[PDB]
DNA sequence: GGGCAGTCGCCGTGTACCTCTCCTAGAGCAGCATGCG
RNA sequence: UUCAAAGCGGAGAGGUA
DNA sequence: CGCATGCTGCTCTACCTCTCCATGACGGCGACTGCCC
């Protein structure tokens, strides 16, 4: 909604399926926020690298996310002014899209947030007593599902950093980056976008969103109803000769 | 010609221990054949026994 | 038994020869790959006749 | 002439095994005309261990990947993909139209710069 | 452009208590029983 | 002066009201 | 009389990909998609 792009295009730019143009300067067939391809980028490179004429100010295309750059380029105040100026005139039947865009832009202006905070650069780790290690009867360990996901994230991050240190070929660095994206995505929410991550058996692992979201999640199981002390339970029989307001306790 | 009823006991079957054990044996045998094929080619000289 | 009912489909969808039949079958089963006659043959053999 | 270097993504813990099996496959298929060479890069660094032994650890620069020199052909591609314990070729990726999974990948040859850089 | 039928994917589907069973693959390394001349 | 050694998570199947 | 080889227990770490694991539920609601003007 913020970037004025369909979900498919943004999803293709992420996950390293296509490119995006960040500056189309000094060209005729290139537009801002236009999705390129591998062959298209190669054929444009065949002309930009010749450096014959009419191609100064090299255009930048980027096959990674580059969502940080697109979201940083936003200029909320004048975007809101332009959107209001356009929404003032003409309605047709499909100005609801501009209404949604204006609502989101106004929310971000009022809260004084930055849209580029939707792209993560650091992540937090939960304290270790909320993901404890328990010991079974035979001496075997039953570790949680969060520890596996954290281990996968840390291992992929360390491997990618090591590869970046040695100045490896870029076509492998991109594979590492895509795998790291998928790992962090599976930690945050498992099986939402791509494929579910299975553990020991073919059963899915429990992510951070599964803790809070279900009927057996925290909200409905631990906060709106609990177990208590000084309580008991037993079978009931009939007692005559009792008065109402009296009961018989063993 | 006539359409079919799926709740009819003429369109329903019973499986017992024999069939289920047969399926499990089949799966295990497929895995074993994969291991055998992987292992048989790792050696150039025969020096091998079944 | 009633060939004109299928003749309607033949006319509406266009007659296919073996080569293009396998071409289209491969295209619809496994999109994104270059069509091949041997590819379609192997796909059918693995799907139903194995 | 067209001897291009490609990188193949390999399963975890299968680097020497896949190289040995692939060399056996090419030598028995007599297809040296298309598949030329298979290699993995290493470096024997030196590290102090816990017991004080000055151990020469042979660390791979690119864990999980193997390098080949070959000529791109449909038969060659099909007979390298069919090797057990290999995932795919690293290269340009395409979206899967129906289903959820990795789709067709177009292999990308390595430019002379980095292959000259690594091999020294 | 306007307007769709048609289709694909995500959301949701009673409460309290009792009994039983089972719970990660692969590879690397070291010490004891067995058939033969 | 100190406490202190008994509590553990998940999955499946069945039952009572 | 003594010498050579398979079996068992412990330890140590690491993860990605498929032929996809199913194709008998039902309603509601929102977001693409091909087709006809």
Per-residue H/E/C for D83-98: CCCEEEECEEECCCCC
Resolution expressed in Å:
2.9
What lies within 8 Å, CB to CB, of B30 at 6+ separation is none
User: Token pair for residue C45?
Assistant: 């053999």
Contact across the interface for D21 and B44, Cβ inside 8 Å: no
Q: How far from chain centre, in Å, is Cα C33?
A: 16
User: Token pair for residue A16?
Assistant: 């390293």
Q: Residue A105: count other Cβ atoms within 10 Å of its Cβ.
A: 20
Distance in Å, residue D13 CA to nucleotide G12 C1': 14
Q: How far is CA A38 from CA A43, D4, D107, in A?
A: 9, 19, 12
User: Token pair for residue A146?
Assistant: 């969060």
**Alpha-carbon span A64 to A177, nearest angstrom:** 9
**Alpha-carbon span A31 to A20, nearest angstrom:** 10
Nearest residue by alpha-carbon distance to C1' of F8: A134
Considering only CB atoms, A17 lies closest to which of D7, D65, D94, namely D94
Query: Residue A173 in contact with residue A164, Cβ under 8 Å?
Result: yes
Q: How far from chain centre, in Å, is Cα D97?
A: 28
Q: Residue D84: count other Cβ atoms within 10 Å of its Cβ.
A: 13
**Alpha-carbon span C15 to C5, nearest angstrom:** 15
Of A165, A163, A200, A202, the residue nearest A179 (C-alpha): A163
Contact across the interface for A171 and D61, Cβ inside 8 Å: no
Query: Residue D38 in contact with residue D22, Cβ under 8 Å?
Result: yes
Distance in Å, residue A179 CA to nucleotide G16 C1': 9
Backbone angles phi, psi at D46, to 5 degrees: -120, 135
User: Token pair for residue D42?
Assistant: 């290493």
Give the sheet arrangement for strand A19-23, strand by strand: A35-36, A19-23, A60-61
**Alpha-carbon span A69 to D40, nearest angstrom:** 37
Contact across the interface for D97 and C33, Cβ inside 8 Å: no
Query: Residue D46 in contact with residue D56, Cβ under 8 Å?
Result: yes
The rounded radius of gyration (Å) of the Cα atoms in chain C is 13
Query: Residue D104 in contact with residue D95, Cβ under 8 Å?
Result: no
A162-172 b/e (C-beta count within 10 Å ≥ 16 → b)? ebeeeebbebb
**Alpha-carbon span A48 to A55, nearest angstrom:** 6
What lies within 8 Å, CB to CB, of A220 at 6+ separation is A214
Residue/partner pairs of D111-120 with CB below 8 Å, 24 or more apart: D114/A168, D114/A169, D115/D5, D117/A167, D118/D41, D118/D61, D119/D41
What lies within 8 Å, CB to CB, of A120 at 6+ separation is A184
Strand partners, D39: D67
Report the residue of chain B nearest D21, measured CA to CA. Answer: B42
Total H helices, total E strands in chain B:
1, 0
**Alpha-carbon span A76 to A153, nearest angstrom:** 34
User: Token pair for residue A185?
Assistant: 């995505």
Contact across the interface for D93 and A159, Cβ inside 8 Å: no
Distance in Å, residue B37 CA to nucleotide E34 C1': 31
Report the residue of chain D nearest C30, measured CA to CA. Answer: D98
Give the sheet arrangement for strand D65-70, strand by strand: D35-39, D65-70, D4-10, D86-89
Nearest residue by alpha-carbon distance to C1' of F11: A203
- Block residue for tokens 């009819």: B8
| Eight-state DSSP code of residue A215 | S
């Amino acid at each position: 909604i913020l970037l004025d792009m369909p979900l498919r295009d943004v999803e293709q730019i992420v996950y390293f399926n296509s490119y995006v143009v960040l500056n189309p300067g000094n060209h005729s067939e290139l537009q801002y926020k236009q999705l390129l391809n591998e062959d298209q980028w190669m054929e444009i490179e065949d002309q930009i690298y010749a450096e014959e004429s009419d191609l100064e100010g090299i255009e930048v295309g980027i096959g990674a996310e580059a969502l940080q750059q697109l979201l940083q380029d936003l200029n909320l105040n004048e975007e809101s002014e332009k959107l209001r100026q356009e929404i003032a005139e003409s309605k047709g039947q499909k100005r609801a899209k501009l209404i949604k865009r204006l609502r989101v832009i106004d929310n971000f202006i009022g809260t004084e947030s930055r849209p580029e905070w939707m792209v993560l650069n650091v992540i937090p780790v939960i304290p270790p007593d909320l993901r404890p290690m328990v010991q079974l009867d035979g001496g075997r360990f039953a570790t949680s599902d969060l520890n596996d996901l954290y281990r996968r994230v840390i291992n992929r991050n360390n491997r990618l950093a090591r590869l970046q240190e040695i100045l490896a070929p870029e076509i492998i660095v991109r594979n590492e980056k895509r795998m790291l994206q998928e790992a962090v995505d599976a930690l945050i929410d498992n099986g939402r976008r791509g494929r579910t991550v299975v553990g020991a058996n073919n059963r899915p692992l429990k992510s951070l969103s599964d803790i809070i979201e279900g009927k057996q999640g925290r909200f409905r199981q631990n906060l709106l109803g609990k177990r208590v002390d000084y309580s008991g339970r037993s079978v009931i029989v009939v007692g005559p000769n009792l008065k109402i307001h009296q009961c018989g306790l063993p | 010609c006539e359409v079919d009823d799926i709740d009819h006991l003429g369109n329903r079957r019973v499986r017992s221990v024999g069939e289920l054990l047969q399926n499990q044996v089949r799966v295990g045998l497929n895995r074993l054949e994969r291991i055998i094929r992987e292992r048989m080619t790792v050696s150039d000289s025969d020096s091998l026994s079944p | 038994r009633h060939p004109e009912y299928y003749q309607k489909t033949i006319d509406k969808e266009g007659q296919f020869s073996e080569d293009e039949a396998l071409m289209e079958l491969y295209r619809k089963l496994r999109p994104g790959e270059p069509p091949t006659v041997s590819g379609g043959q192997q796909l059918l053999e693995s799907r139903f006749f194995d | 002439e067209k001897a291009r270097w490609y990188a193949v993504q390999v399963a975890s813990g299968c680097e020497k095994r896949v190289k040995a099996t692939l060399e056996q496959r090419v030598q028995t298929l007599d297809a040296a005309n298309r598949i030329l060479q298979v290699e993995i890069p290493e470096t024997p660094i030196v590290k102090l261990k816990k017991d004080g032994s000055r151990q020469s650890a042979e660390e791979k620069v690119f864990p999980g990947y193997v390098l080949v020199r070959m000529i791109l052909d449909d038969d060659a591609w099909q007979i390298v993909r069919n090797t057990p314990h290999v995932i795919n070729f690293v290269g340009a990726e395409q979206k899967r139209p129906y289903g959820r999974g990795r789709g067709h990948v177009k292999p990308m040859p390595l430019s002379p710069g980095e292959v000259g850089r690594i091999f020294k």
